[PDB]
């Protein structure tokens with residue numbers, strides 16, 4: 001049995017996506033999650049929805065409690081976690097409104113805890129050095145790509161996301177530099193969310209939605225405008241993808257993730 | 269009416285630049301500024317001078333309260349902020365003693381608050397994502413460039429400043445890497461000073477003074493020696509530029525900056 | 537007279553390397569060192585051994601008290617500090633099991649104090665801007681290189697170490713990016729250890745041991761396995777190098793390091 005956690009990004013966190021909804025506030029050894037967990041279903045699959053920035057969007061990227069968010073979903077029984085995120089495009093072919101099923105990342109964050117094993121919590125003892133060669137779940141990404149195709153949506157099969165600290169946008173010199181590094185899209189929330197999911201042994205995948213071309217003219221109003229016009233795409237993709245995930249086998253995949261996570265910890 | 273704030277860098281903060289001086293200690297919601305504000309005039313223009321590292325240079329770059337400094341100047345009524353900064357040259361044509369009117373930056377800092385909107389101060393509520401495509405005021409930069417020309421000074425019309433955390437200087441491998449990224453000069457204080465000025469709706473410009481060629485032989489004694497020999501240039505440039513700024517129209521420019529700052533904030 | 541401090545890395549910290557051993561716990565103005573100092577000798581040379589991650593390896597790279605470790609060694613009278621470190625290879629010619637006598641570094645750390653002069657300790661007052669053009673002691677590196685040759689070991693004469701924050705390993709996009717920057721090997725502990733040693737006026741050198749090819753397949757088990765198989769090399773290199781260092785003159789070298797450190801401090 002699978003249980004899908006869903007973390008909604010800026011203007012991509014509509015609770016009406018689930019049927020038979022029930023609100024539930026929880027606590028974790030790492031503090032409180034961004035907001036209440038919303039329990040429900042999509043067809044016959046159990047899901048858990050969470051707004052990354054809170055229902056009223058009051059939390060900046062640097063202040064999101066990524067540890068609490070991932071821990072709460074893991075504690076609720078989530079085997080998979082599929083998220084949505086607004087991002088800027090660093091490539092001509094990635095047009096605003098396009099979806100990108102990212103497969104790699106480049107870290108540019110500075111003030112964020114990236115591990116549960118900080119030597120100050122009973123629940124996670126020791127030192128953890130988690131592998132990051134393949135940060136996103138290939139099987140989940142494969143289903144997302146095929147589903148976008150069946151839906152006729154403009155979608156890119158791969159892409160490298162550079163995550164900046166924020167909250168400011170990048171300068172033009174930074175924008176051009178990121179392109180030479182191999183980055184394709186840019187945001188402020190992929191890291192450490194993807195890292196902590198891996199430590200928890202969860203299959204993590206991300207639906208990135210391009211909202212602008214950065215500055216290589218971006219502004220809050222421009223970002224919000226593009227999201228309003230295209231949010232239906234991410235909603236349709238999730239509704240159609242989820243039942244598909246719940247109809248296939250994940251025993252072997254989840255076992256391997258559990259092993260990788262367990263054997264990355266160094267005990268005294 | 270305009271009021272020019274002036275933030276003086278290492279060995280480039282002489283108070284005798286203003287006439288009719290008056291010392292004034294202030295406080296801000298973000299703490300105390302580096303030192304007392306010095307109120308005075310240059311011809312008929314009102315100015316406010318502030319020493320970035322304190323009068324006795326006792327504050328390292330990482331510890332400067334950039335938030336308090338910018339907030340205090342904004343509170344005093346400053347419409348413009350022109351600063352001075354010592355820097356290393358990463359380009360053969362930028363010789364020690366040369367002035368560079370920078371137009372871009374690359375952030376390499378790690379432990380610095382870059383926004384007033386940290387969700388813990390009544391005066392700045394919400395989440396702010398300020399645009400950084402054009403970090404420095406083009407009109408102010410234009411006047412600085414033309415004035416340097418009238419003064420016959422060696423001056424570069426543009427340049428990208430890479431700001432490192434410090435307090436240590438860069439390694440040789442880092443120095444060469446910065447050059448491949450497109451950086452032209454290097455310092456430890458441009459970021460987040462330029463970012464916070466933008467959030468405040470202030471016209472910000474920077475007078476960078478090359479003091480060495482980094483290491484692609486730099487030392488504290490070498491830096492201080494070059495500054496002593498060339499400080500008169502920055503002083504002459506400011507004295508001649510300021511009356512020029514006070515004789516032109518800034519209503520439309522200040523209005524646009526105010527709009528950009530206001531529309532970058534996301535409210536609950 | 538010389539006194540060699542030795543900081544042992546992951547699986548490269550065997551105390552049996554010294555004769556006439558005596559355990560000694562100390563304290564510093566910056567807190568407690570990773571573990572007790574082990575006083576002893578190699579032939580006729582006085583040495584001080586310290587385990588970077590503690591005897592039971594319970595401290596992650598981000599949490600190591602680099603300030604306390606370097607301060608404690610300096611306080612004990614150490615003139616030299618030679619360390620061991622496990623690392624990943626970013627170059628085909630650097631094979632797992634090979635030794636690399638590094639000569640440069642690229643900083644990718646974010647949450648680490650890199651100076652003793654933080655303006656909050658009586659023992660180190662003022663602002664220090666230490667030069668980093670040549671981070672490692674050339675004379676000590678020369679002896680290590682010649683000794684490895686006499687021992688017939690596969691050893692590289694130079695190399696650039698990129699130090700990441702950790703504790704996670706790098707993504708594949710990051711791995712490829714580091715190669716384009718000029719990095720040859722990768723670890724999580726060189727910075728700020730090398731920086732603080734320079735501030736203390738100590739001759740610092742590093743014996744890097746390649747344990748894998750990063751991901752341009754790395755895992756904790758793979759790293760530990762390679763170290764177990766090759767640890768004897770680092771031990772033999774240290775035992776043979778140390779008596780050689782104790783037989784040559786260091787007065788002029790130590791004097792120059794002391795001058796560089798003293799003249800990098802800015803007093804009120």
Ligand SMILES: CSC[C@H]1O[C@@H](n2cnc3c(N)ncnc32)[C@H](O)[C@@H]1O
Nearest residue numbers: 086087088186187188189214218223
């Ligand atoms: C609300 S505008 C910025 C927010 O949307 C995302 N974003 C959209 N476009 C960009 C961009 N060009 N650069 C960085 N983040 C972006 C970021 O993750 C942040 O949470």
Ligand SMILES: CSC[C@H]1O[C@@H](n2cnc3c(N)ncnc32)[C@H](O)[C@@H]1O
Nearest residue numbers: 354355356454455456457482486491
């Ligand atoms: C006092 S020497 C270092 C100081 O001067 C500036 N500086 C001058 N040359 C350099 C350089 N090569 N690299 C970094 N900062 C430099 C920095 O902003 C710091 O405040």
Ligand SMILES: CSC[C@H]1O[C@@H](n2cnc3c(N)ncnc32)[C@H](O)[C@@H]1O
Nearest residue numbers: 622623624722723724725750754759
């Ligand atoms: C125990 S595996 C990671 C530890 O060994 C070193 N290390 C070995 N291989 C690598 C690698 N590929 N990337 C980063 N650190 C590495 C790091 O400094 C850390 O303390």
